[PDB]
Amino acid sequence: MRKIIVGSRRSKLALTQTKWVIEQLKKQGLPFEFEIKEMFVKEIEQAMLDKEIDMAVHSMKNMPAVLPEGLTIGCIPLREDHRDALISKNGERFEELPSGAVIGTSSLRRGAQLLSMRSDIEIKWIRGNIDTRLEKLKNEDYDAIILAAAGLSRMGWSKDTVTQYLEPEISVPAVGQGALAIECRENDHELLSLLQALNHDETARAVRAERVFLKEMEGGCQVPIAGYGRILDGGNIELTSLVASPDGKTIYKEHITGKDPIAIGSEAAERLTSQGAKLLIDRVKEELD
Numbered sequence: 001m002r003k004i005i006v007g008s009r010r011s012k013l014a015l016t017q018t019k020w021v022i023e024q025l026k027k028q029g030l031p032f033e034f035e036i037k038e039m040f041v042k043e044i045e046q047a048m049l050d051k052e053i054d055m056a057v058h059s060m061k062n063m064p065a066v067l068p069e070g071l072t073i074g075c076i077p078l079r080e081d082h083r084d085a086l087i088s089k090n091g092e093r094f095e096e097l098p099s100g101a102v103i104g105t106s107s108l109r110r111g112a113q114l115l116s117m118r119s120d121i122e123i124k125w126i127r128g129n130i131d132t133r134l135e136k137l138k139n140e141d142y143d144a145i146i147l148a149a150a151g152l153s154r155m156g157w158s159k160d161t162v163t164q165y166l167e168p169e170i171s172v173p174a175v176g177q178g179a180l181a182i183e184c185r186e187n188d189h190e191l192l193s194l195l196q197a198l199n200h201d202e203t204a205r206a207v208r209a210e211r212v213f214l215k216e217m218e219g220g221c222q223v224p225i226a227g228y229g230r231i232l233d234g235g236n237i238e239l240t241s242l243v244a245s246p247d248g249k250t251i252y253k254e255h256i257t258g259k260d261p262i263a264i265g266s267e268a269a270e271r272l273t274s275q276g277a278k279l280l281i282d283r284v285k286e287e288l289d
């Protein structure tokens with residue numbers, strides 16, 4: 001009887017993710033209707049607090065570090081590929097790219113880590129969805145681009161479209177990359193129970209440590225900040241956390257393994273802030289203004 005209203009972005013990726021979640025939730029056979037309402041992060045959240053919509057599906061790396069009171073992340077499904085992906089026009093791996101090669105990405109996080117590995121290449125802004133950026137790679141003045149492996153996966157691109165999957169040792173992923181967030185109201189106990197079966201605890205634990213570090217550093221998509229957690233055999237969370245200068249010449253990196261997501265994320269931020277990472281972040285945020 002109850003029709004769950006799911007608010008979604010207009011883009012092809014967002015609607016693809018939203019339909020995937022709805023089809024997943026339907027496998028539980030519980031009596032709910034689902035209906036997408038095409039609707040900015042503030043607009044979605046206020047519409048959810050206004051109860052105009054009941055939930056929304058976002059890429060976790062696009063979630064704000066701080067949710068407004070009354071809203072929660074109700075479900076984090078099994079994580080897809082977390083890695084950044086290099087796609088080279090002429091098929092060169094990162095270490096094979098010619099001197100001065102132009103790599104297209106508008107993410108300071110991605111560009112700064114690449115420049116920290118090779119400062120003889122250039123990072124240049126690029127816009128468009130996956131299909132657009134891939135076509136720009138064939139023409140134009142880019143020697144390679146960086147995309148999220150999970151985005152390529154969810155958009156039906158073959159794994160062999162990627163020239164090189166970047167391991168965290170070369171590029172620490174954005175916090176939450178490869179994960180989805182289902183946002184809903186904190187007191188919507190009915191929806192929360194429905195979302196429980198889709199939640200993957202191991203993914204949620206790791207992402208929770210990433211997000212605590214992101215929150216305590218006041219980070220976001222515009223900040224060269226990165227964090228990736230995974231569950232080790234025995235239950236320990238391993239968190240790699242990184243803050244980089246835009247030019248790639250300053251790298252704050254912290255590796256922490258432990259049991260508690262909040263404790264690990266908190267220590268990561270504390271250790272990096274004491275070295276000067278927070279001062280770097282504030283300078284980059286100022287330079288954007």
Ligand SMILES: *Cc1[nH]c(C)c(CCC(=O)O)c1CC(=O)O
Binds near residue numbers: 061062106109220
């Ligand atoms: C937070 C965020 N969201 C997207 C889609 C991106 C990548 C942008 C790009 O041009 O590569 C980011 C930044 C990030 O750290 O991945």
